[PDB]
Structure formats: structure tokens, C-alpha cells
């Protein structure tokens, strides 16, 4: 059918635009400040997604700047970006296409009264943590970690983090808005309105995703900040004054009984280390990958339930390990090339 | 059949302990910080609600203290309150029982593609505003105005505000937490984390309820603070710096509200919405000023009746306390035929 041709700029490297053509354009949903479509590149016949947002024009788009700077196997990649109109100027990001979301998958198991096999919970959570160790190493915080922003390829078990419309370089000393991050996944300090939060808010969110995958429903639900805190308190106990001071300095004023009996002790151990009141006490993304809960992924014989091999899991780079190099000794198993 | 008898304290009358007996304790759902049961009073065979919450001896119950001082035709009345067993202490509040909530009713119309007949939108919204004018006159802010806390009697069209588990006396100068209020109904200043907010946050919430009833769905939805703001901006335009300062993004302009609602929607309803949903807290109408808005002129008509043939509920029995906010408004709030000597 219809073929659109544009002059787009590659996401990485030399700023040397090239002609790009795509076809079969259908709307595939909705993201942050725009609309995501799916289309097929004519040259390679490969499927891609195209996010499209209105552009300020006398202002540089922050999502685009953060994206042109990332290259990781667990993050959707910016392939190109170009401008289009409708006066109104539109910015178009040409990203990797991924068929499913962790959201929709978990829901399937949920209404069928089934619980996602723990092997997948491991594969998915591990990859999310690698992606976080990576962007954090650049001082970037996603600020919207929730199941809906976790894409999955069903057959390969590869997971990619997406939607960077809320991502931001967090600089010690500068303040940041506290109204970011979706309900159920917001870290306590965000609920208490803190504006001096660090990247550990992403870890709390990830902790909520893990717990949700093991539980079969959100662990800290609530229509208001108050309700959510009541849920959090029911599990982490009441915050000591010291703990309240470390989340937000301007306040105003078991863990096994939580999950079914089958659930592995490691999973619960990891949860408790992620979901902590004190921001500095939560594990770092990298420290999480090296947690025993992921030891099965480091087994040489591990395979997917469909018979296939696991995705790339050990191809760590120096950038990725910068957070804490000595961890390579665990992160990279003996057999791994 | 089982029967429970307890010695409770009247809700407002002088402290003369009364023996109360009830039967049929059945669960009706979750109220903030507790569970609410339904029960039938033995004698009158009248239904009541009983909100049971955990009472930690360290402090006195703030919801209880607030409700004991309240008595208005559009607010749930605290009939009696007594303590009970559990190894913990449970505070029990015997409240008026009302069969439906605005949430459930707007929902039936919603998942069937119809909107609530405007006459009902008027009756319900007006009563909500009276209830707000009243508690605000005491300096109390509900802080959780949403469809689920708006009870309705189907036959009489009477509306009662409930769930005061978040209500608080707001004192100029003292700070207040900003994580109160349910998503979709939070005023901008709350989203921006403000801690010096006034009772006008209840008005913003009420504005969201009105818009929702006219629209058939929430007017400012969003899973995050950011999303909600984008929705608010799409309609109120971008906040000027001055407006941001009084409260404490891809710039968009003023959105003619009429584009927002269905065509057929009354100009008065839209006018009222715009005057309620304002960035500047001090610019939003007061509860009382809202009741006197032209959108409610039909309720002041002497011939007005309910679609089921019945008369409208009490709407003009205003008290001095209620009007304290601005006495001169009585001249409009109390229509002529409501002044005819008996
Ligand atoms: O294949 C994709 N690459 C992407 O970058 C995204 C994506 C997903 C969420 C937000 C943004 Cl900004 C982009 C894809 N998919 C997508 C887009 C919108 C929706 Cl609404 C859904 C979905 O939930 O199914 C998936
Ligand atoms: O008849 C009632 N008197 C009341 O004060 C309440 C009520 C409603 C909401 C919160 C609280 Cl704390 C009490 C009633 N009803 C009620 C209680 C719980 C639920 Cl969960 C629902 C409901 O939504 O159906 C209605």
C-alpha cells in the first residue's frame, strides 16, 4: 500500500541524515506525550515503532537527547528521528518494535488464576536491573518504571525498557519535581513530596514489579497517597523518625506472610532488600543482578521452557560495571564467553 | 436469630449512655481506615451503618471528634459511638445508612452510554455544595471528595457526604500533608506538593465530580501527577508564572470549555465548571457562592418536581452558621416562595 519516505537522522553516531522508507502504518497504542505507531521499513522489511510528539521548536526535546546517548540490549533503541508537520511541528522517534508488555502478560496469568513461572520472573527482573544499572551509570533516572513500560518478545524472553518521556539527568544539589512516577510504583519519598530524591526511586519501582509478578496483583495499591502508605506500612512496619528524615526532611505527620507458600526464599529476600524506607539502603541495580535469586540464570544448562537458549545476559561492558567493578566476578559466570 | 446489645454514647446529644440493640451484622465494604457493616436496629427495624476502626490508645480519634460536632441534612449523621473488643480496641461509629453511592449510579449510566439526567446533576451537586459550605464554615476540609464518598437515596434524591477519615481542621500557618485526596480529583496545588493549601481543594474536587457527571467519565485522568497535569493543561491552558506561584511542559493555550462537553450541555453548567476548576486557589468560587450560581436556578423554581413526581428535598433551610461565610447571599439562596409567612 502507501509508502512514506523521510530524511531521518541516525540515533547514534555521525549526524548524517539518510533517506528512510516505511509502510503498513497502524496505530499501536499510546505513550507519554504522544502516540506510538507501528510500521515496516521497506529496505529491511523489519518492524519498528514510531513515537510522535509535538515539538516546542525553540527548545531541545529532552527525551531525544537522552535517547541518542543510549545503547543497551535491554533498552529500546532509537534508530532514527525526523521532523514532520500537520503549522505545528512534530518530532518522530523511530524505535525498536517489541510485541508484548510485562503488563499484558502478567494480566493473562492473573485472570486465568495462574502465576507466571518463576523462571520468567527471574529472566525479566534480571534484565530490567541490567537496564537500570546502565542508564543510572550515566546519572539518568527513568522515573516511570511500571509493567507497561517493560516490553517483551515472547519467543526469546528478551525484555526492553521503554518510554523515556520522564527520564532525567539527576544532579546532586538540583531539585526535581515529585509528581512523576505512576501510582502503586512510587517510592515513599515521592509520596512524601521529596524533591531531593536519587535514582533509587527506580529500584523501589522495580521492587514493586517483582513483588507484583510473584503475588499476582500490585503489592501497594491505593487511590490516594494515604492509602498507598497504609499498605506499605502494613508490610514494612511503621517508619522510625530516622527513616522519615532520610526520605523527606520536611515531613508533616512479616515478609513471608505476604507471598504464597511456594514462592522461593530468594525472591522474598530480594524484595525486602529492594523495598526499603531508607533510599540509601536499597540494593543498587548491579547489586540486584548478582543476588542469589538470579543464580539459576547463571547455570550453564539453563534453557527456556520452549526449548530455546536464554538471551544475552552476561555481555557486560565497563560502562555497565562502573558502579562496582568487583561484581564482575559473579555477574560473569565461569562458562560465559 | 442473633442479637447484639451495647451501651453507646449519643452522637451529639448530651452524654446520656443508651442501650442499643441491633441484628444482621453484614459487611458492606471498605471505608477509609476500616470496614463498614450494615445492621438493623431491633426496635425500629431501621438500618444503620457501623464503621469499625482500630483505635490506638496513644491518641484520640480525629474523625470522631470532627463528626461529633457535625449535624447537617446532607452529611452522614453519627448516631452513637462505642468501643469494642478484638487483643486491640475497636472504635465503632453508628452512622446513617444510605443505599447507593454516586459512584455506582454514575457508573450504571456510564457503561450503557447514557449520562445522568441534568436535573439530577443539579440536585446532587447543589447538596454537595451545601454540605461543603457547612463543614468549611467550621474550618474543616474533607480532603477526599470523590463520587464514592457521595451517598444517595434513589427515591428522595437526597445526597449525603460521608467518610471523614481524612477530614482536618485547617489552620492558617500550620502545614498539612499533600498526599491526601484520590487521583483524578486532586487540585493542582496538591499535585505540585503544596503544604499550605486551603479548603478550596474540596471545591476543585467537587468541580471534578460535576464535570465527570456531565461528561460520563473523569475529566482529568492519569496514572501519574505528570499525566494528570497534561490533562488539566489541555483544558485550562498553560499556567502563567503568577498562577504557579499561588499554587506553590509543552505550552498550550486556553481551551474553550464548550469543546469539552457534549453539545446540548447547558451553558450554565460549563460556566460553573470553569469557575470551580481554576489554577489560582483564591479564584475558585466558595461553596456558598456556588449554590447561588445560575446553574441551580431551576432548583429555586417553585414548581420544580422530581422526575418521579415527588417534591424536591429540603434545599433552603439554611442556618446562620451555614451562611456565615457571606450572609448577603441569603437574598438569592432563599427564594421568595420560601419566605412566605405561615
Ligand atoms: O514497540 C514499542 N516500542 C516502543 O518504544 C514502545 C513504547 C511503549 C510505551 C511507551 C512508548 Cl513512548 C513507546 C512500543 N510499544 C507499545 C506502544 C504503545 C502501547 Cl499502548 C503498547 C502497549 O501497551 O501495547 C506498546
Ligand atoms: O451507608 C453508609 N453510611 C456510611 O457512612 C457509608 C460509608 C461510605 C464510604 C466510606 C465510609 Cl467510612 C462510610 C455507607 N455506605 C457504604 C460503605 C462502604 C462501601 Cl464500600 C459502600 C459502597 O461503595 O457501596 C457504601
XYZ file of C-alpha atoms and ligand atoms in Angstrom:
729
model
C 0.000 0.000 0.000
C 1.162 3.516 0.913
C 4.887 4.207 1.368
C 6.229 7.194 3.294
C 9.778 8.409 2.668
C 11.691 10.663 5.007
C 15.139 12.023 5.615
C 15.935 10.832 9.122
C 18.978 11.149 11.318
C 20.549 8.038 12.843
C 20.128 7.757 16.602
C 23.788 7.166 17.285
C 26.970 8.383 15.659
C 27.600 10.892 12.836
C 24.809 13.383 12.352
C 24.440 12.449 8.668
C 20.756 12.115 7.613
C 19.661 9.437 5.141
C 16.502 8.543 3.248
C 14.285 6.054 5.089
C 11.081 4.433 3.833
C 8.333 2.629 5.701
C 4.839 1.256 5.069
C 1.837 -0.522 6.657
C 1.362 2.163 9.278
C -1.073 1.229 12.051
C -1.584 2.816 15.484
C -0.183 0.577 18.219
C -1.267 2.316 21.346
C -0.367 5.395 23.382
C 2.740 6.797 25.118
C 3.717 9.667 27.428
C 3.212 12.874 25.478
C 2.299 11.329 22.157
C 1.183 8.412 20.044
C 3.123 5.315 19.103
C 2.579 3.694 15.683
C 3.960 0.614 14.084
C 5.290 0.460 10.567
C 7.570 -1.673 8.411
C 10.857 -0.491 6.899
C 10.877 -1.201 3.145
C 14.639 -1.746 2.830
C 14.828 -4.464 5.515
C 11.152 -5.350 5.842
C 11.651 -5.108 9.615
C 9.004 -3.851 12.077
C 9.589 -0.655 14.044
C 7.655 1.672 16.276
C 7.341 5.406 15.783
C 6.606 7.651 18.770
C 5.412 11.113 17.700
C 5.215 14.278 19.822
C 4.554 17.990 19.243
C 7.779 19.996 19.251
C 8.492 23.285 21.071
C 10.971 24.319 18.382
C 12.719 26.966 20.471
C 13.546 24.184 22.938
C 15.530 20.921 22.696
C 13.479 17.759 23.313
C 14.767 16.050 26.451
C 13.686 12.504 25.582
C 15.532 12.735 22.253
C 18.742 13.920 23.897
C 18.699 11.119 26.444
C 17.913 8.521 23.781
C 20.644 9.442 21.265
C 23.041 8.664 24.094
C 21.960 5.086 24.990
C 22.900 1.716 23.516
C 21.964 -1.328 25.555
C 20.412 -4.662 24.691
C 17.740 -4.216 27.389
C 16.584 -0.747 26.243
C 14.512 0.018 23.174
C 16.863 1.674 20.694
C 16.452 4.978 18.913
C 17.107 4.113 15.252
C 16.215 7.465 13.706
C 14.322 10.650 14.410
C 12.960 13.187 11.942
C 10.529 16.116 11.760
C 7.075 16.280 10.182
C 4.131 18.684 10.203
C 0.347 18.910 10.296
C 1.886 24.786 11.003
C 2.545 22.584 14.076
C 5.902 20.768 14.180
C 6.153 17.071 15.090
C 9.176 15.140 16.337
C 9.243 11.461 15.299
C 11.370 8.820 17.081
C 11.885 5.545 15.224
C 12.316 2.864 17.856
C 12.701 -0.902 18.134
C 9.384 -2.799 17.946
C 8.555 -5.299 20.692
C 5.280 -7.389 20.537
C 4.316 -7.692 24.220
C 4.494 -5.843 27.536
C 5.060 -7.263 31.011
C 1.732 -5.675 31.859
C -0.428 -7.616 29.424
C 1.485 -10.857 30.105
C 1.045 -10.701 33.885
C -2.670 -9.981 33.373
C -3.032 -13.155 31.337
C -1.729 -15.284 34.173
C -3.737 -13.198 36.601
C -7.220 -13.737 35.228
C -6.526 -17.368 34.447
C -5.822 -17.838 38.143
C -2.230 -18.860 37.299
C 1.132 -17.497 38.431
C 3.890 -16.672 35.927
C 6.514 -19.440 36.244
C 9.338 -18.164 38.439
C 11.841 -18.774 35.684
C 10.314 -15.935 33.662
C 10.125 -13.728 36.721
C 13.917 -14.188 37.019
C 14.693 -13.588 33.346
C 12.525 -10.462 33.233
C 13.621 -8.921 36.539
C 17.300 -9.522 35.843
C 17.126 -7.770 32.506
C 15.244 -4.847 33.964
C 18.036 -4.441 36.512
C 20.765 -4.533 33.919
C 18.940 -1.815 32.006
C 18.758 0.251 35.202
C 22.427 -0.282 36.119
C 23.228 1.054 32.672
C 21.187 4.276 32.484
C 21.973 5.035 36.138
C 25.676 4.745 35.377
C 25.099 7.883 33.262
C 23.255 9.543 36.141
C 19.906 9.154 34.357
C 16.747 8.142 36.206
C 13.778 6.676 34.274
C 11.167 7.865 36.758
C 8.313 5.736 35.395
C 9.193 2.095 35.968
C 5.939 0.155 35.764
C 4.842 -3.056 33.919
C 3.511 -1.072 30.980
C 6.984 0.265 30.138
C 8.594 -3.183 30.066
C 8.449 -4.729 26.579
C 8.848 -8.459 25.894
C 9.493 -10.683 22.936
C 7.535 -13.900 23.798
C 9.812 -16.291 21.904
C 13.209 -15.047 23.022
C 12.366 -13.878 26.534
C 14.186 -10.634 25.807
C 12.999 -7.640 27.785
C 13.468 -3.999 26.800
C 12.789 -0.884 28.896
C 10.912 1.876 27.072
C 9.234 5.283 27.292
C 11.871 7.778 28.353
C 9.485 10.707 28.303
C 10.043 11.196 32.049
C 13.742 10.313 32.224
C 16.107 12.946 33.585
C 19.771 13.509 34.488
C 19.643 13.809 38.307
C 22.318 16.159 39.692
C 23.190 16.164 43.413
C 22.093 19.608 44.520
C 19.444 20.372 41.913
C 15.763 19.828 42.766
C 13.341 17.627 40.856
C 9.561 17.553 40.661
C 7.986 14.905 42.866
C 4.830 14.334 40.868
C 6.491 11.887 38.470
C 6.010 8.104 38.532
C 2.731 6.130 38.310
C 0.512 5.009 41.210
C 1.458 1.769 43.063
C 5.096 2.084 41.984
C 6.048 5.386 43.604
C 8.762 5.251 46.252
C 7.822 6.566 49.746
C 9.973 9.708 49.454
C 7.980 10.614 46.332
C 4.691 10.201 48.197
C 6.027 12.444 50.997
C 6.701 15.052 48.297
C 10.521 14.943 48.444
C 12.364 16.854 45.703
C 15.917 15.735 46.552
C 15.387 12.070 45.585
C 18.036 9.917 43.879
C 17.923 7.177 41.266
C 16.965 4.690 43.937
C 13.331 5.536 43.221
C 13.676 3.308 40.103
C 14.797 0.465 42.328
C 11.720 0.843 44.546
C 9.556 0.729 41.417
C 11.362 -2.375 40.225
C 10.819 -3.876 43.657
C 7.090 -3.284 43.193
C 7.157 -5.003 39.798
C 8.900 -8.078 41.241
C 6.503 -8.339 44.140
C 3.609 -7.934 41.724
C 4.839 -10.724 39.484
C 5.168 -13.117 42.453
C 1.874 -12.017 44.040
C -0.372 -11.777 41.003
C -1.520 -8.234 41.847
C 0.023 -4.896 42.921
C 1.604 -5.073 46.348
C 0.920 -1.453 47.402
C -2.379 -0.301 45.852
C -4.399 2.743 46.775
C -6.295 5.577 45.128
C -4.516 8.144 47.298
C -1.100 8.741 48.817
C -2.596 7.922 52.193
C -3.948 4.520 51.190
C -0.702 3.551 49.489
C 1.249 4.413 52.653
C -1.118 2.327 54.761
C -0.357 -0.620 52.506
C 3.381 -0.002 52.645
C 3.278 0.293 56.418
C 1.288 -2.924 56.799
C 4.339 -4.639 55.353
C 7.447 -2.617 56.258
C 6.122 -1.664 59.674
C 5.950 1.949 60.809
C 8.787 4.251 59.736
C 11.143 5.261 62.537
C 11.778 9.021 62.789
C 15.227 8.494 61.316
C 13.697 6.699 58.339
C 11.229 9.528 57.799
C 14.093 12.038 57.845
C 16.038 10.241 55.094
C 13.062 10.048 52.701
C 11.803 13.593 53.063
C 13.473 16.011 55.537
C 10.344 18.205 55.573
C 7.685 15.781 56.834
C 4.423 16.999 58.394
C 2.931 13.964 60.217
C 6.433 -10.176 58.323
C 7.600 -10.560 54.733
C 6.901 -14.253 54.269
C 3.299 -13.907 55.397
C 2.967 -11.809 52.235
C 3.519 -14.329 49.454
C 2.006 -17.764 48.884
C 3.909 -20.725 50.411
C 5.540 -21.973 47.208
C 7.397 -18.719 46.437
C 11.223 -19.138 46.719
C 13.037 -17.692 49.749
C 15.429 -15.851 47.405
C 12.657 -13.918 45.706
C 11.332 -12.755 49.068
C 14.843 -11.934 50.239
C 15.390 -9.770 47.155
C 12.076 -7.991 47.629
C 12.915 -6.992 51.172
C 16.251 -5.607 50.033
C 14.635 -3.517 47.293
C 11.582 -2.230 49.122
C 13.296 -0.260 51.893
C 12.256 3.031 53.504
C 15.837 4.293 53.598
C 16.779 5.152 49.986
C 20.500 4.508 50.525
C 19.760 1.067 51.944
C 18.147 -0.350 48.822
C 20.362 -2.535 46.638
C 21.803 -0.920 43.522
C 20.716 -2.274 40.134
C 24.048 -4.078 39.755
C 23.933 -5.478 43.278
C 20.488 -6.843 42.423
C 21.663 -8.718 39.328
C 24.252 -10.513 41.474
C 21.596 -11.565 44.002
C 21.174 -15.327 44.543
C 17.609 -15.204 43.226
C 19.233 -14.991 39.766
C 21.669 -17.862 40.303
C 19.630 -20.151 38.078
C 20.240 -17.799 35.121
C 23.950 -18.272 35.664
C 23.639 -22.048 35.316
C 25.238 -23.305 32.038
C 22.412 -25.717 31.337
C 19.575 -23.240 31.820
C 17.132 -23.131 28.884
C 13.745 -21.531 28.172
C 10.531 -23.564 28.650
C 10.144 -23.553 24.862
C 13.496 -25.291 24.402
C 15.431 -22.229 23.205
C 18.533 -20.745 24.812
C 18.390 -17.749 27.106
C 19.040 -14.241 25.699
C 22.356 -12.397 26.111
C 22.792 -11.963 29.873
C 26.495 -11.650 30.502
C 27.762 -9.358 27.767
C 28.516 -6.685 30.370
C 30.553 -3.587 29.384
C 32.896 -1.468 31.516
C 30.364 1.359 31.491
C 27.776 -1.002 32.906
C 30.024 -2.240 35.730
C 31.484 1.183 36.606
C 29.099 1.287 39.549
C 31.088 -1.536 41.222
C 33.684 -3.469 39.078
C 34.473 -6.183 41.632
C 30.993 -7.585 40.925
C 32.068 -8.907 37.530
C 33.415 -11.975 39.323
C 29.796 -13.013 39.997
C 27.951 -11.322 37.190
C 30.070 -13.137 34.616
C 29.853 -16.887 35.300
C 32.844 -19.207 34.605
C 31.451 -20.682 31.406
C 30.256 -17.366 29.874
C 32.363 -16.355 26.866
C -31.560 -15.004 65.302
C -28.528 -13.436 67.000
C -28.814 -10.038 68.671
C -26.073 -7.672 69.879
C -26.669 -5.089 72.606
C -24.129 -2.408 73.511
C -24.068 0.719 75.666
C -23.187 3.649 73.391
C -22.808 7.426 73.639
C -25.199 9.596 71.616
C -23.591 11.203 68.577
C -24.377 14.777 69.581
C -26.969 14.919 72.355
C -25.706 15.249 75.961
C -23.648 12.249 77.137
C -26.543 10.035 78.345
C -25.429 6.397 77.668
C -28.101 4.467 75.762
C -28.622 0.773 75.346
C -28.575 -0.060 71.632
C -29.558 -3.450 70.160
C -29.071 -4.472 66.562
C -29.129 -7.549 64.365
C -27.923 -8.784 60.957
C -24.338 -7.569 61.081
C -23.220 -7.954 57.462
C -20.245 -6.395 55.665
C -20.877 -3.650 53.117
C -17.333 -2.754 52.123
C -14.189 -0.772 52.961
C -14.282 2.731 54.429
C -11.015 4.625 54.884
C -9.046 3.029 57.750
C -11.713 0.435 58.452
C -14.641 -1.739 57.498
C -18.232 -0.639 57.347
C -21.041 -3.003 58.255
C -24.763 -2.797 57.846
C -27.102 -3.632 60.721
C -30.771 -3.425 61.612
C -31.816 -1.695 64.829
C -34.037 -4.198 66.663
C -36.730 -1.781 67.822
C -37.408 0.500 64.801
C -36.133 -2.178 62.445
C -34.270 0.688 60.801
C -30.969 0.139 59.009
C -27.707 1.776 60.057
C -24.055 1.575 59.113
C -21.274 0.785 61.552
C -17.740 1.827 60.663
C -15.303 -0.206 62.744
C -11.699 1.025 63.017
C -8.627 0.161 65.059
C -8.177 2.620 67.924
C -4.640 3.030 69.245
C -4.887 4.353 72.831
C -1.996 6.771 72.231
C -4.246 9.342 70.513
C -7.912 10.347 70.394
C -9.795 9.666 67.135
C -9.815 12.738 64.858
C -12.687 11.523 62.692
C -14.767 11.020 65.810
C -14.098 14.479 67.199
C -14.977 16.034 63.869
C -18.186 14.128 63.412
C -19.487 14.693 66.934
C -19.629 18.397 66.134
C -21.487 17.952 62.832
C -25.223 17.943 62.152
C -26.409 18.800 58.609
C -29.143 17.342 56.379
C -26.572 16.453 53.693
C -23.937 14.790 55.845
C -23.997 11.323 57.324
C -25.076 11.602 60.946
C -23.117 9.986 63.773
C -25.881 8.304 65.785
C -23.842 6.636 68.517
C -20.276 5.552 69.021
C -18.981 2.890 71.349
C -15.847 0.825 71.876
C -15.490 -2.935 71.430
C -13.201 -5.981 71.510
C -10.832 -7.575 69.022
C -6.119 -8.011 71.556
C -6.938 -4.465 70.401
C -9.581 -1.746 70.872
C -12.125 -1.047 68.127
C -13.963 2.275 67.848
C -17.439 1.794 66.387
C -19.410 4.573 64.716
C -23.109 4.045 64.150
C -23.941 6.181 61.103
C -26.960 6.769 58.868
C -27.251 4.045 56.236
C -27.779 5.090 52.616
C -28.409 2.507 49.796
C -26.462 3.961 46.840
C -23.308 5.945 46.078
C -22.824 8.458 43.301
C -20.014 6.265 42.045
C -22.247 3.265 41.415
C -25.041 5.287 39.884
C -22.935 7.363 37.528
C -21.359 4.042 36.560
C -24.607 2.351 35.573
C -25.319 5.232 33.215
C -21.685 5.210 32.076
C -21.404 1.565 30.998
C -24.546 1.846 28.899
C -23.631 5.080 27.112
C -26.102 7.421 28.847
C -25.479 10.411 31.076
C -27.279 11.210 34.292
C -30.274 13.496 33.587
C -29.172 17.041 34.269
C -31.945 17.616 36.792
C -30.228 15.027 38.997
C -26.831 16.553 38.317
C -28.262 19.806 39.742
C -29.886 18.232 42.788
C -26.758 16.250 43.626
C -24.195 18.978 43.047
C -26.198 21.578 44.954
C -26.449 19.382 48.013
C -22.777 18.552 47.876
C -22.027 22.281 47.929
C -24.288 22.950 50.872
C -22.503 20.191 52.777
C -19.172 21.820 51.922
C -20.283 25.339 52.867
C -21.224 23.864 56.216
C -18.108 21.930 57.227
C -15.897 24.693 55.806
C -17.695 27.234 57.982
C -16.063 25.328 60.884
C -12.678 25.476 59.152
C -12.848 21.753 58.332
C -11.712 20.351 54.985
C -12.931 16.906 53.846
C -9.875 16.217 51.685
C -11.364 13.239 49.833
C -14.273 14.472 47.756
C -14.882 11.847 45.073
C -18.041 10.055 43.760
C -17.525 7.131 46.118
C -17.995 9.350 49.193
C -21.277 10.767 47.967
C -24.258 8.715 49.174
C -27.731 8.851 47.573
C -31.212 7.754 48.411
C -32.715 6.842 44.990
C -36.335 7.684 45.860
C -35.847 11.020 47.631
C -32.834 12.332 45.695
C -31.192 13.202 48.986
C -27.418 13.258 48.963
C -25.147 12.830 51.982
C -21.380 13.348 52.190
C -19.518 10.594 54.019
C -16.138 9.198 55.090
C -14.431 11.796 57.237
C -11.376 9.683 57.804
C -9.271 12.328 56.036
C -11.051 15.478 57.249
C -8.994 18.026 59.176
C -9.235 21.465 60.801
C -7.012 23.605 58.524
C -5.298 26.452 60.398
C -3.673 29.345 58.505
C 0.007 28.943 59.326
C 0.129 25.214 60.074
C 1.303 22.784 57.375
C -0.672 19.844 56.026
C 0.365 16.687 54.211
C -0.122 16.868 50.454
C -0.587 13.175 49.800
C -4.282 13.224 50.681
C -7.133 13.104 48.145
C -7.795 10.396 45.468
C -6.323 10.559 41.954
C -8.457 12.403 39.352
C -9.802 14.741 41.994
C -6.627 16.318 43.380
C -6.297 20.085 42.997
C -3.191 21.345 41.110
C -1.530 22.723 44.252
C -1.704 19.242 45.762
C -0.035 17.729 42.698
C 2.705 20.363 42.952
C 3.269 19.148 46.522
C 1.994 22.309 48.283
C 1.568 22.089 52.061
C -0.074 25.493 52.635
C -3.300 24.681 50.803
C -6.746 25.906 51.911
C -10.219 24.368 51.867
C -10.588 25.320 48.233
C -9.100 21.934 47.357
C -12.547 20.465 48.180
C -14.075 22.832 45.650
C -11.660 21.662 42.949
C -12.627 18.076 43.757
C -16.295 18.958 43.566
C -15.601 20.631 40.231
C -14.151 17.326 39.019
C -17.268 15.470 40.181
C -19.574 17.858 38.316
C -17.548 17.666 35.113
C -17.493 13.882 35.440
C -21.247 13.640 35.793
C -21.773 15.797 32.695
C -19.040 14.044 30.688
C -19.646 10.415 31.588
C -16.015 9.862 32.621
C -13.296 11.571 34.697
C -12.220 14.881 33.219
C -8.570 14.786 34.371
C -7.371 11.149 34.384
C -3.801 9.955 34.615
C -1.742 7.301 36.360
C 0.823 9.896 37.412
C 0.972 13.509 38.522
C 2.500 14.390 35.165
C -0.293 12.826 33.128
C -2.974 14.483 35.222
C -1.326 17.875 34.698
C -1.175 17.348 30.965
C -4.929 16.761 31.010
C -5.566 19.827 33.167
C -3.401 21.960 30.908
C -5.151 20.741 27.756
C -8.244 22.402 29.182
C -7.171 25.332 31.378
C -4.265 26.262 29.136
C -0.737 26.629 30.475
C -0.338 28.162 33.950
C 1.122 31.659 33.952
C 4.052 32.130 36.345
C 1.774 34.059 38.697
C -0.678 31.175 38.743
C 2.134 28.734 39.513
C 3.231 30.932 42.412
C -0.220 30.944 44.038
C -0.369 27.139 43.838
C 3.229 26.603 45.089
C 5.547 21.442 29.999
C 4.712 21.845 26.266
C 2.889 25.184 26.450
C -0.715 25.013 25.201
C -3.406 27.759 25.132
C -6.879 28.429 26.570
C -9.307 25.645 25.644
C -12.889 26.884 25.151
C -14.621 24.564 27.603
C -17.662 24.144 25.331
C -15.464 21.904 23.154
C -15.076 19.674 26.240
C -18.723 18.727 26.852
C -21.412 17.222 24.639
C -23.415 19.677 22.559
C -26.780 20.101 24.409
C -24.886 20.681 27.644
C -26.238 23.847 29.329
C -24.073 26.984 29.201
C -24.565 27.441 32.962
C -23.045 24.061 33.811
C -19.962 24.870 31.759
C -19.781 28.350 33.271
C -19.838 26.839 36.754
C -17.160 24.317 35.869
C -14.774 26.999 34.697
C -15.305 28.951 37.894
C -14.555 25.903 40.046
C -11.618 24.415 38.174
C -9.164 27.295 38.476
C -5.379 27.189 38.926
C -5.442 30.054 41.420
C -6.937 28.644 44.638
C -8.318 32.017 45.799
C -10.116 32.478 42.473
C -12.338 29.434 42.735
C -15.899 30.097 43.917
C -16.673 29.322 47.538
C -19.189 26.547 48.286
C -21.867 29.137 49.100
C -21.102 31.209 46.023
C -21.560 28.003 44.006
C -25.012 27.249 45.383
C -26.144 30.725 44.276
C -24.830 30.146 40.723
C -27.406 30.370 37.925
C -26.894 26.705 37.048
C -29.017 25.980 40.136
C -31.767 28.469 39.292
C -34.117 25.649 38.298
C -33.981 24.283 41.872
C -35.237 27.619 43.084
C -38.327 27.415 40.874
C -41.494 26.873 42.993
C -42.933 24.331 40.549
C -39.827 22.173 40.307
C -40.503 18.466 40.989
C -38.566 15.200 40.690
C -38.947 13.053 37.548
C -40.771 10.510 39.729
C -43.436 13.076 40.625
C -42.221 13.728 44.195
C -41.157 17.053 45.655
C -37.532 18.080 45.943
C -35.686 17.562 49.256
C -35.033 20.384 51.755
C -32.850 22.890 49.893
C -33.432 26.243 51.543
C -33.455 25.505 55.257
C -30.187 27.465 55.628
C -28.864 28.303 59.118
C -26.811 31.302 60.239
C -23.794 29.049 60.686
C -24.119 27.962 57.088
C -24.346 31.497 55.718
C -21.612 32.977 57.962
C -19.250 32.766 55.002
C -21.238 35.530 53.253
C -24.696 36.488 54.731
C -25.759 38.810 51.888
C -26.163 35.679 49.735
C -29.306 34.644 51.584
C -31.201 37.003 49.297
C -30.595 34.533 46.457
C -30.139 31.302 48.295
C -33.569 31.651 49.874
C -36.144 32.107 47.092
C -39.285 34.287 47.630
C -41.746 31.410 47.995
C -39.514 30.057 50.753
C -40.107 33.311 52.641
C -43.903 33.336 52.513
C -45.234 33.779 56.089
C -47.075 30.793 57.579
O 7.173 -1.460 20.340
C 7.344 -0.460 21.038
N 8.439 0.288 21.052
C 8.266 1.307 21.887
O 9.088 2.212 22.058
C 7.017 1.204 22.546
C 6.542 2.116 23.568
C 5.802 1.661 24.708
C 5.343 2.588 25.695
C 5.612 3.982 25.578
C 6.350 4.458 24.464
Cl 6.724 6.146 24.301
C 6.807 3.537 23.466
C 6.401 0.057 21.922
N 5.097 -0.487 22.013
C 3.885 -0.035 22.510
C 3.425 1.303 22.285
C 2.207 1.732 22.832
C 1.429 0.826 23.604
Cl -0.001 1.495 24.205
C 1.842 -0.530 23.847
C 1.109 -1.416 24.579
O 0.802 -1.198 25.785
O 0.676 -2.432 23.965
C 3.100 -0.935 23.277
O -24.413 3.750 54.211
C -23.319 4.234 54.519
N -23.089 5.079 55.539
C -21.811 5.455 55.517
O -21.307 6.276 56.299
C -21.123 4.791 54.461
C -19.745 4.972 54.133
C -19.320 5.091 52.772
C -17.951 5.270 52.444
C -16.980 5.343 53.467
C -17.386 5.233 54.824
Cl -16.227 5.336 56.070
C -18.753 5.046 55.158
C -22.130 3.973 53.844
N -22.064 3.038 52.787
C -21.030 2.323 52.174
C -19.947 1.766 52.936
C -18.911 1.076 52.292
C -18.936 0.922 50.884
Cl -17.598 0.078 50.317
C -20.005 1.452 50.064
C -20.073 1.320 48.702
O -19.229 1.834 47.917
O -21.009 0.607 48.259
C -21.052 2.161 50.754
